[PDB]
Design a protein. Structure first.
Length: 226
């Protein structure tokens, strides 16, 4: 078998690819999704993941510094964009620009991942800092342990707006995009793919995730290929 730990933003794409791979191979693929931080820390503590896909460079570097992945056993696989979302039925259009006053446009709570550890939240904090909004945004935050928990709080109306990836907004019929963060407000959203356990079955799945067949799945869900 092969165990794959993947950032929560990858849930749908990796579930689709698991099913494809299981149809094409006599191999069982086990999946675990959570925030990239949680998953990396679990691997560090001994969890038997064969493959790790992070939603940022930092949590793969965290493992590399601990000798848990080699520099030549990781590759930058996918990109994404950062977006503002609203619940369906409370649509907004907000310009993610220094000129905008967050106290005027954000009149309730703002849901996103924990800004110190979860990739989506870290990207969000970079953008708020770049925009000059941080000290006005922070008091409004509800912080979650992965991007899909935040997506669901917005879907359920618990938060007026949320910050998720473009791919998350596309997967949920219950939220709409209110704005797209310009790329120059944050570090590029990059998903590194890492081979943690080197065996025949894990190396084959790692190559499969780079394959022409997988590119089609990731593009369907709105990721960019790097």
């Amino acid at each position: 078998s092969v165990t794959v730990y993947a950032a929560a933003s990858l849930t749908n794409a990796i579930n689709d690819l698991e099913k494809i791979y299981e149809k094409q191979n006599k191999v069982e693929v086990k999946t675990s999704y959570a925030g990239s931080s949680t998953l990396a820390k679990q691997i560090e503590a001994g969890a038997p993941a064969d493959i790790f896909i992070s939603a940022d460079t930092q949590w793969m570097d965290y493992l590399q510094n601990k000798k848990l992945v080699a520099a030549n056993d990781r590759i930058n696989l996918l990109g994404n964009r950062l977006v503002l979302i609203t619940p369906k039925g409370q649509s907004l259009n907000i310009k993610l620009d220094k000129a905008t006053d967050p106290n005027k446009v954000f009149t309730g709570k703002i849901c996103t991942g924990d800004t110190k550890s979860v990739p989506v939240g870290k990207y969000a904090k970079q953008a708020f800092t770049n925009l000059g909004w941080w000290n006005r945004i922070e008091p409004k935050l509800v912080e979650t342990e992965d991007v899909r928990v935040a997506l669901n709080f917005v879907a359920r109306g618990e938060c007026q707006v949320g910050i998720v990836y473009a791919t998350d907004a596309a997967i949920s019929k219950d939220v709409k995009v209110a704005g797209i963060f310009p790329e120059n407000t944050h570090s590029p959203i990059i998903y590194p793919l890492g081979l943690i356990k080197k065996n025949s079955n894990s190396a084959k799945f790692y190559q499969f995730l780079q394959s022409n067949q997988a590119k089609a799945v990731f593009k369907k869900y709105g990721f960019s290929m790097l």
